[PDB]
């Protein structure tokens, strides 16, 4: 179904990767967040929201859901309550870029563009049949 | 025609808002940067890239691509070479929140969704029968 997204977060480098799947197509979305942190994943939610339509959101981590201020923005927005190939994409590209940020985001590319039609054009495909 | 795409920085606060605009629908993404950068635009246009068609890319300050970063990004990804309207409707819910940057993500969000089809619907139509 269209609108369910799946959002947890990874480990690499001593940093955080924020990764949402939607789920019936398999694209991607990631971004290198500074903590493991509330405002982290509402701000994160806010930007996934106002790109896509987002009805609703899983998670492996319930628990990451449970602050205010992620319940603020799932208000705000309408929004009601991988891994291991990424980071085998990341690893594939990291010696290319200096900074992590800049390897995830590459990954993300190479991940929706492929064809496994890619991921891109299935999220798109999907949600126009929708409408 | 699709795959293009406008891209700017205004300043609001004394901060940069980088703002890129699909032609063909009006759909908007924006980033709050510390920094008018070769750097910043480059990795915005890295995660613009990895989300959509992004074929071509125009701005209204041509020096802003300039940069060998830039051009770097551009190469990597296939790319080739309304701030009044946001400012507006960041106005009006800058006071729901303290950053900058997530008046910026909500107001992105009240664009996109609006009936004027919302840009988000537009955006989603207008890629899905190019495939
Ligand atoms: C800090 C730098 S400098 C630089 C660069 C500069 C000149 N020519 C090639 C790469 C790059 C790029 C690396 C790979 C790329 C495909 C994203 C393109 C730009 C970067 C890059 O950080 C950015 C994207 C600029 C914030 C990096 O983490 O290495
Ligand atoms: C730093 C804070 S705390 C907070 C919040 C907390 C509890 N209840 C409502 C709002 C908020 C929110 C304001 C509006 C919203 C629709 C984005 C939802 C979350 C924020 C928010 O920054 C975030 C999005 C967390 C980085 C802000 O700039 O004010
Ligand atoms: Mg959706
Ligand atoms: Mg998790
Ligand atoms: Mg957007
Ligand atoms: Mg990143
Ligand atoms: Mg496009
Ligand atoms: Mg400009
Ligand atoms: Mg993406
Ligand atoms: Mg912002």
């Known amino acids: ?33 500074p903590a493991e942190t509330g405002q982290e994943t509402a701000y994160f939610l806010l930007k996934l929201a106002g790109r896509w339509p987002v009805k609703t959101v899983h998670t492996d981590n319930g628990s990451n859901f449970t602050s205010t201020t992620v319940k603020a923005a799932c208000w705000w927005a309408g929004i009601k309550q991988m891994n291991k190939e990424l980071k085998k994409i990341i690893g594939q590209v990291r010696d290319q870029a200096e900074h992590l940020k800049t390897a995830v985001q590459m990954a993300v590319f190479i991940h929706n563009k492929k064809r496994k039609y890619s991921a891109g054009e299935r999220i798109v495909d999907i949600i126009a049949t929708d409408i």
């Open 1 to 33: 179904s269209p609108g369910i997204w799946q959002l947890d977060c990874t480990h690499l480098e001593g940093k955080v990767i924020l990764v949402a799947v939607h789920v019936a197509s398999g694209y991607i979305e990631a971004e290198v967040i």
